[PDB]
Ligand binder design. Structure first.
Ligand SMILES: NC1Cc2ccccc2C1
Ligand SMILES: NC1Cc2ccccc2C1
Lengths: 546, 546
């Protein structure tokens, strides 16, 4: 009965195998078959390659030792190497060409999700090349998905030596019979087999996965498209910035590169961006996912005036000042989308680029009171119910689990009406006391929002809706301006409050506006269609932000 | 009696004035005197320039309006503009050429240090140019040094209008007589003078500073070289990463760009880097100043084994993994310097570059026990006193203020002997109960270290010295390796424990080693000679790390 899956890196989790390159170089350079291959394995266990794999020497120290072996292999071969020969250049591009074998990674991910203990067992080196970051990035990406990474150069043991297998079994705390081991090199499979471990010779991925699926009884081949990597809150870097004596802002941070500031809506969390954070960090960005003022670990003062847009924007500017950031890309959703257009309008120097999900940019009407403007739309009637302090708080704070389960639902799952909510006397009047769990969220994810909202409740979050008149007056100062920095508007087909049609006149204010559109997507864009959101944002960031 | 100083940006805090460029362009392009100057001020209070300065329009919207004014000014002038004319290009380079007037900033800094309320009052615009980051960086740098920044485009008022002066006085909470106002434009000084404010017409900096010094009675001209900008702990972004169930690491973060990880020694803090953090962030780096395991807000487990170098290095690798950093530059001092060479030796793929202050890289002696190696040097006798658990803790924890005041001293201020400390029965045996305050630290800075050390005491910090045998065995695995990634060794002339001579054979292990040397510098390099440390690190980072 299996409970652990072990994978090799070269030829299994990463393709093409760096090993394959030596045979490819020989035939491309019309050299005798296996010559470069011989130089690589010369001296066997006391040879330069074994010393490299054991961590006795670095890759840079090894390069001249392999080069010498190439000369010695030619003396015996009675053939000559051509002029511009560089072992460094061959390995540099071999390593650079090697990419993650995505279907093998997905299978490993699927096995772990079903309760397996996963590990990478690899014969590798200490890379001190000027170009080492490429592989550091690859190892960094792959390792986060496994319980253990066992590298020969760190443990001082190599495959096929039997001690590394006993080391692996001890690390796994599993009997050989409980372990499936996958490798592309027959010689390295043999010692695992002798212990009674299930082994898979990996030639082509599909056959290897077919063998893996047969032997584990779990579906890995032809499975539905997986969700992007999500965030485990306790594994994140948590940051805290005091923006003013009584206001502290909390954020989660991941990656290196240009600063990307994520701004959630109502009633959300930094966690609402869980599917974007790893994807954007992997795409070459430094993600700062905020807990907006009034939410989670951020300060939640009681006063309504603490939540007017001008104050919220000034605080986000102070946040950049204190982190030493001259700019950041601002990406918002719902209330965050509103703040984000206003950041672009009042602080264009601090905004590298601006993107919004669902929230359009609609310029304030100088001739219509914000309350009259709410009158113009039946969808925005819930905003009038939010005006009276205490009313909405009482209903939303009464049962937290019910609140989030009722709100966080895909377009076709809605148990709630946004109409005559004031007439009905609440947004949970027509709703069950025990809502069913939406296909968008696990029970664990709902419970995270519940624990977050237990600290400050809905007062601070509801206060964002309580400054309509102040926001309107402030916005009227920008009526002569245009947004001329890079901008993206992402519309969601099934958002029945923030409808795509509301964005139609945006090009009059943002002439160079870029667009994105998501079909079959409700209000909760980030969790509804994460794969699509990531694809649109990454593509726009690489073209307009970078 | 003065208590506030107000400065203009253009022509006062930033030079050359963007205004100066329009007269320079005219004579370089042989255009009629004042023509470009006329186009800039056209329509006066209802003109495009006033609308720009009030925040009614952005800089990008303004560019075509100024261009039109240049054509209208030519119709009347009866002269023609030449082919390749761009107002954008003229302003782009004018803004780009404009740099901080360092002596004016130092005077403002000196006035604030003496208790003055400082502010910047400027007529500026909303910059939405593709090149806006340049000015964002300049504003970001300047603003942190003042109590207030009042920008015309944010307040919707402009100089010379009287309302901005009443707005300034109200912001300052000061009577005009208590305020000195400096400006390069006579027309903008006049309304401040009418209120009874002390005014300075700024032509050349020296005369303006001469007038300022005379009127305030504080020395600003010919003053000794100021210390670099330090850190106010409550104004920093504080980060927390869980590296393992019982271990959390704390760090302070500032800036954007390549990751620079700062590793303090014994018995220090992230705060030991207070003079480097703002300087390195300003130089284009993302600074991560650590609280090493056992210190400040970082976890301090009691077990000795939790502090062996292998465990400490693995945790720093996990720290990078959790922040999503494939690499960082590692800069260490004392015990941090030791960890930093070991990070380079065991994880070269994760280390972009390595630098050490005072701490040399000395390879473990396979033939000598670490205790015998300590025997070989009288300077390292204090390490034997640190071996017995409880002894050093009791002496160091007895009086915290005495501990730091006695330890943190410049080369010629020492009140302590590092010899026969075990024979004497402590390192505070020959020391006063009330040590004098060293010229290196303020009373406030000592009190910061006192409050930090009150949380966990000296057990965790002393445990770094308690794994000599484990460290020696681990280090022996690297005896065949060389450090071939970019490296910097900075020696301190007056460090009587970590003497420069100890670094002499480092080139045998690190052939491409770069060096730095600081004269008249004790053990506490960072606070002893901050200006020099910053200069050496910035120069090396720009050449080898970037
Ligand atoms: N349209 C008004 C409503 C609102 C909310 C936030 C910021 C500006 C404005 C203007
Ligand atoms: N020289 C030994 C003392 C020490 C301290 C830390 C890491 C390695 C070693 C080797």
């Amino acid at each position: 009965t299996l409970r652990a899956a072990v994978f090799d890196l070269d030829g299994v989790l990463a393709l093409p195998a760096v090993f394959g390159v030596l045979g490819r170089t020989e035939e491309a350079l019309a050299l005798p078959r296996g010559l470069l291959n011989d130089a690589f394995q010369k001296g066997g266990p006391e040879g330069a390659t074994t010393r490299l794999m054991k961590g006795e020497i670095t890759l840079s120290q090894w390069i001249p030792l392999m080069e010498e072996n190439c000369r010695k292999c030619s003396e015996t071969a009675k053939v000559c190497l051509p002029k511009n020969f560089s072992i460094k250049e061959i390995f540099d591009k071999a390593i650079s060409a090697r990419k993650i074998n995505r279907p093998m990674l997905q299978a490993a991910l699927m096995l772990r999700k079903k309760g397996f203990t996963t590990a990478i067992l690899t014969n590798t080196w200490l890379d001190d090349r000027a170009e080492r970051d490429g592989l550091a990035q690859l190892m960094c990406e792959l390792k986060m998905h496994f319980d253990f990474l066992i590298e020969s150069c760190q443990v001082g043991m190599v495959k096929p030596e039997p001690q590394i297998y006993k080391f692996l079994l001890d690390t796994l705390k599993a009997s050989p019979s409980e372990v499936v081991f996958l490798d592309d090199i027959g010689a390295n499979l043999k010692p695992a087999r002798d212990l009674g471990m299930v082994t898979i010779l990996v030639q082509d991925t599909d056959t290897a996965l077919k063998e893996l699926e047969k032997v584990t009884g779990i579906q890995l081949l032809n499975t539905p498209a997986p969700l992007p990597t999500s965030c485990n809150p306790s594994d994140m870097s948590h940051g805290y910035v005091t923006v003013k004596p009584r206001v502290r802002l909390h954020f989660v941070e991941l990656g290196s590169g240009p600063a990307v500031c994520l701004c959630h809506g109502f009633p959300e969390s930094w966690y609402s961006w869980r599917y974007q954070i790893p994807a954007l960090a992997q795409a070459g960005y430094r993600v700062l996912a905020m807990d907006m003022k009034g939410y989670g670990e951020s300060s939640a003062p009681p006063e309504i005036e603490e939540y007017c847009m001008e104050v919220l924007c000034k605080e986000m500017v102070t946040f950049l000042d204190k982190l030493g950031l001259s700019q950041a890309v601002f990406i918002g959703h719902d209330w965050g989308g509103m703040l984000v257009w206003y950041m672009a309008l009042f602080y264009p120097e601090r905004v590298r680029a601006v993107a919004s999900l669902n929230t359009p940019f609609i310029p304030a009407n100088p001739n219509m009171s914000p309350l009259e403007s709410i009158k113009a739309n039946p969808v925005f009637d819930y905003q009038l119910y939010f005006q009276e302090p205490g009313v909405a708080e009482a209903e939303l704070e009464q049962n937290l689990s019910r609140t989030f389960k009722s709100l966080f639902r895909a377009s076709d799952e809605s148990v709630l009406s946004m109409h005559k909510v004031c007439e009905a006397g609440g947004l949970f009047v027509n709703s069950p006391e025990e809502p069913s769990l939406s296909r968008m969220v696990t029970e664990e994810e709902i419970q995270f929002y519940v624990q977050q909202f237990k600290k400050s409740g809905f007062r601070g979050p509801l206060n964002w809706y309580r400054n309509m008149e102040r926001n309107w007056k402030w916005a009227c100062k920008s009526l002569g301006r245009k947004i001329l920095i890079p901008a993206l508007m992402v519309t969601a087909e099934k958002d029945f409050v923030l409808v795509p049609q509301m964005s139609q006149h945006m090009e009059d204010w943002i002439p160079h506006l870029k667009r994105g559109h998501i079909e079959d997507c409700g209000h909760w864009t980030q969790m509804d269609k994460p794969t699509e959101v990531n694809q649109i944002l990454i593509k726009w960031l690489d073209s307009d932000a970078r």
